Amino acid sequence: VQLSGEEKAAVLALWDKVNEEEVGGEALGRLLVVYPWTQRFFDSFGDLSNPGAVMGNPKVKAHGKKVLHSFGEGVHHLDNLKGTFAALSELHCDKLHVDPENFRLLGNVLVVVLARHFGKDFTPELQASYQKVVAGVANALAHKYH
Amino acid sequence: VQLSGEEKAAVLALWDKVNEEEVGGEALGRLLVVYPWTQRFFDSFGDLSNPGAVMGNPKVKAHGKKVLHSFGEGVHHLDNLKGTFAALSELHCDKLHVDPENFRLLGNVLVVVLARHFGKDFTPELQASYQKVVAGVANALAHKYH
Amino acid sequence: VLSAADKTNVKAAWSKVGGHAGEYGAEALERMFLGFPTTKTYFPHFDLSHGSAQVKAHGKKVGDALTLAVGHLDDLPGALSDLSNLHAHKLRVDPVNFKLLSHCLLSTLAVHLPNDFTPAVHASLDKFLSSVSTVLTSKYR
Amino acid sequence: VLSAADKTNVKAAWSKVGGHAGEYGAEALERMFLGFPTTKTYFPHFDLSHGSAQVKAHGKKVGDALTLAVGHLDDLPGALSDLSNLHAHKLRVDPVNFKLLSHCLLSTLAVHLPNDFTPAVHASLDKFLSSVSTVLTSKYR
Numbered sequence A, B: 001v002q003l004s005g006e007e008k009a010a011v012l013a014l015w016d017k018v019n020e021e022e023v024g025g026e027a028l029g030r031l032l033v034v035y036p037w038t039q040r041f042f043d044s045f046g047d048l049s050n051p052g053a054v055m056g057n058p059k060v061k062a063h064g065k066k067v068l069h070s071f072g073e074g075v076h077h078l079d080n081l082k083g084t085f086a087a088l089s090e091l092h093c094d095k096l097h098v099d100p101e102n103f104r105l106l107g108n109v110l111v112v113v114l115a116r117h118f119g120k121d122f123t124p125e126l127q128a129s130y131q132k133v134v135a136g137v138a139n140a141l142a143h144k145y146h
Numbered sequence C, D: 001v002l003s004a005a006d007k008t009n010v011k012a013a014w015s016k017v018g019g020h021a022g023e024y025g026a027e028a029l030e031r032m033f034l035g036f037p038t039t040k041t042y043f044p045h046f047d048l049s050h051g052s053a054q055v056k057a058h059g060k061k062v063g064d065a066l067t068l069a070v071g072h073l074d075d076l077p078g079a080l081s082d083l084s085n086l087h088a089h090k091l092r093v094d095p096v097n098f099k100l101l102s103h104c105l106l107s108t109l110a111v112h113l114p115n116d117f118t119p120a121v122h123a124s125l126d127k128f129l130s131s132v133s134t135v136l137t138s139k140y141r
Ligand code: HEM
Pocket: A038, A041, A042, A044, A063, A066, A067, A070, A071, A088, A091, A092, A096, A098, A102, A103, A106, A107, A137, A138, A141
């Protein structure tokens, strides 16, 4: 996206410290708990009835890890987000029929989880850069939509 | 945008019948009445305190006409919306700081006004095509945003 | 729920809708399905073709619920409680879809009642539909 | 306003915020101004640099209003009436901006109270902030 060289370096440096399993599981779990309508798309994962069930569900953790890995590809390809997510945009629009507003919700949840894991190191300036990244990913995933 | 040849012809045929002054004045006026926070950006137009004042204000009519004329350029350049609205995107983001959610609101208001003027001729199928057009314009205006 | 002036406007406008509430409900659904295809996924068991008998029947139910709401503006949560459970707890309808249906309902009213659909009435109806939507998604809240 | 379980969660979480409400309010504003530059246009008369005395003072006012809200969960419209007028009628704040500030407040709470910011508490706080936002924009409704 539109990031300065100094910003890009800071974004990449934080990603070196991101455990995609831990962060991914947490982010997807929080999405499902905080915005419960999103549970509709994940009925095959089984019991998602209470926070405890969600956060400890192995399919939630595994899928969360895949989501974060995909975010990671975006972070390392900031100049071609549209190309990086083209196939995934197709999947989310044509096959899953996910409303794009939910991409922004997940992106924001991700930012809250990064804040929780990194504390004071996740400065207002670094958060601002990450907001640009998640908006960019959200926009790239919405590309093939109507 | 992504329209079939039959859809494009129907969209263009309706535009032949659009009075940009009447429709434009009405659309901008309704935006200001229905979503009152948008009045903040148009304080230089004077009294916008009640529906009567808004709908009859000459600056609202004149500006509405300009907005619709710009929409018209989009309708006749559906294959290059991003290029057609590049300068306007810059203006709305860098100078005016309009949140992009408001572009969608105005687009939807426009659709309601077309429905009111054309009645049964504004079929569900034709509305569906116009929804694609207004989303496309909204997305093109949001391009230069952060 | 709304301001006194809005309630007045809403009751008045709905009186002009009168016996057409069901027809308008059906048309609004058709406009939503064509204009916003993501919404079709909530109705797999429906024949969504134009003139579908199921869409007509369902539009009647939607129109009747809106008529019920107009009669209980000071207690929407009470009057629509059953529907709130259905939409949020059972069906898990994404809140964005209420905005889409609301827009399609306003579009439908503009088509059929162009002289009654004034800016002031438009504004009050938008507030009314938003209030109904808030109640129907209140279990997410 | 909220469910009984949410009120419990909100009162409990806010007790852990305690005397830091003002500091968190200031930090949340800083995060919003940097992350979402469109929001700066509401504060032309402010020095928005880091450590700005005006931002600190304003964050205290924001934090105090949230503390007041937590104490009046069963009557938010009454307790925040003055602020609703200010934000919707005088300042004409675009409703989208309340969502941005809410997100920045949750981000700030996660930074400082990582062990207390559990999924259940996160969910209740989101509902709380949405309810407050609804009240502050209620004149548009
Ligand atoms: C940051 C935004 C998102 C990214 C990067 C992302 C990424 C992915 C990836 C990598 C997959 C696996 C692709 C595959 O099946 O081969 C996937 C599948 C899926 N996504 Fe997303 N996703 C995002 C947001 C969402 C949201 C918001 C929802 C719905 C609320 C959603 C619903 C699904 C579902 C239901 C699947 C299929 C899961 C299955 O295998 O059963 N995604 N996504």
